[PDB]
């Protein structure tokens, strides 16, 4: 097929399921690298990393929803960078 099929089925599936979409191991290294800049030799509880991942995934899902809305605003189906930029600006994160 083309731009019109499997994306919708993937939407349906990944919205029905609630598993973590981001891999645990690669995200843990990212979190530790971000923490490095604040305190050397820092430890993280597993539950803390899981909470960080959950918060990040929820924030990204909300951002993509607001970005899908921005894309639909311009008669467009594809989300472009300016969509996320507008979503963040109206959010007040990068005004």
């Amino acid at each position: 097929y083309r731009p019109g099929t499997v994306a919708l089925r993937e939407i349906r599936r990944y919205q029905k399921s609630t598993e973590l979409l981001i891999r645990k191991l690669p995200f843990q290294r990212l979190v530790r690298e971000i923490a490095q800049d604040f305190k050397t030799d820092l430890r993280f509880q597993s539950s803390a990393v899981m909470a960080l991942q959950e918060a990040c995934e929820a924030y990204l899902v909300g951002l993509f929803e607001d970005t899908n809305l921005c894309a639909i605003h311009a008669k467009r189906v594809t989300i472009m960078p300016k969509d996320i930029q507008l979503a963040r600006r109206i959010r007040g994160e990068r005004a």
Binding site: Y14, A51, L63
Partner: protein, 81 residues
């Protein structure tokens, strides 16, 4: 470190967009997503390490992350104990 922000590959961002109702994704969306997730994690982890250092602790507890998210208005349930 070895550029761990690239540990968020295109399939992961694509799944996240799928869950967010996105129908089609552009090519440059992935860089913007990795930069926004990075900025968010920066603030969250800064708040967590600020709560930790003040406690003279060497481990970032889950309660620290919960309080950090609560400061940002991102209150998270599931780790309150």
């Amino acid at each position: 470190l070895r550029d761990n922000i690239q540990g968020i590959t295109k399939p992961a961002i694509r799944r996240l967009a799928r869950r967010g109702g996105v129908k089609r994704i552009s090519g440059l969306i992935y860089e913007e997503t990795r930069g926004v997730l990075k900025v968010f994690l920066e603030n969250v982890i800064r708040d967590a390490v600020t709560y930790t250092e003040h406690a003279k602790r060497k481990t970032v507890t889950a309660m620290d992350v919960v309080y950090a998210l609560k400061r940002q208005g991102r209150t998270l349930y599931g780790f309150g104990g």
